[PDB]
């Protein structure tokens, strides 16, 4: 898993930032009218060549706000090019997210976009077979 202290917050967010243990990072305030990056994971998840991964996000939210993930896929050794961008919705997160093996190892870099107003508690980002 990726602990909440690997999550960095977008510098445009003007609200309340709090990290509680290794349980969650709480972002509370105004997220904007349309989806806009709130937070991001600073570390990457590797998906290896014959080892498919599924992801779970522990989280909990409050208020008239919504969030989604943007997952971006990078070949091993890519510096800046992504071959896929996957919008994951909150309903998509009721189930595990499948990342299939590929011909090369690749890496994920995951954004949290949010809109509305409220309190988003991002928790542990889990990874399993």
């Amino acid at each position: 898993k990726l602990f909440p202290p690997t999550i960095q917050v977008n510098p445009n967010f003007t609200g309340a930032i709090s990290y509680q243990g290794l349980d969650y990072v709480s972002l509370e305030g105004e997220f904007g009218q349309d989806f806009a990056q709130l937070a991001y994971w600073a570390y990457n998840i590797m998906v290896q060549k014959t080892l498919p991964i599924e992801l779970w996000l522990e989280y909990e939210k409050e208020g008239n706000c919504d969030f989604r993930l943007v997952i971006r896929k990078m070949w091993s050794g890519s510096v800046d090019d992504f071959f896929e961008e996957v919008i994951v919705s909150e309903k998509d997160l009721e189930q595990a997210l499948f990342m299939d093996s590929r011909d090369g190892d690749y890496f994920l870099s995951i954004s949290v976009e949010a809109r509305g107003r409220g309190t988003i508690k991002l928790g542990n980002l889990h990874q399993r077979w």
Binding site: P5, V9, T14, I17, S18, Y19, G21, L22, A42
Partner: protein, 143 residues
């Protein structure tokens, strides 16, 4: 467009002692810590003078120092028992071996950058603080 800093801040939370810890951020780049279940002698935070981006995914927070030069370190924070936290500074040679560990239980002290040093780390250690607001510290040459 780059903003000028006279001081060193907490930076990102990655690598803070987090077992039982909440860490709150404010617009002045200060930081508030709280941890009731916390014994003494644990390393709260460490600042580094050289890091690899891939592993660290921040930039180093400590400035390059000159070997055999004396420096004035000044910490600025509010702690509720005034001695709820203290500082240690550790010097490492080119191959990663410790040359020297200083412990200081005050907010202003003088240290010398050891003649064989190559990197160094400033650490804050816990001593059962109730409340800690950490503002910043600084490291300045001495004429």
């Amino acid at each position: 467009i780059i903003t000028q800093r006279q001081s060193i801040h907490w930076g990102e939370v990655g690598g803070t002692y987090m077992y039982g810890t909440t860490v709150s951020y404010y617009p002045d780049k200060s930081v508030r810590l709280y941890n009731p279940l916390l014994p003494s002698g644990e390393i709260l935070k460490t600042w580094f003078s050289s890091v690899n981006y891939q592993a660290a995914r921040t930039q180093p927070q400590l400035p390059l120092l000159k070997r055999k030069q004396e420096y004035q370190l000044s910490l600025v924070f509010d702690c509720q028992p005034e001695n709820g936290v203290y500082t240690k500074i550790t010097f490492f040679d080119r191959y990663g071996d410790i040359l020297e560990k200083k412990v200081e239980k005050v907010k202003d002290f003088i240290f010398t950058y050891p003649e064989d040093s190559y990197t160094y780390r400033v650490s804050l250690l816990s001593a059962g603080f109730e409340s800690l607001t950490f503002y910043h510290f600084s490291i300045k040459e001495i004429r």
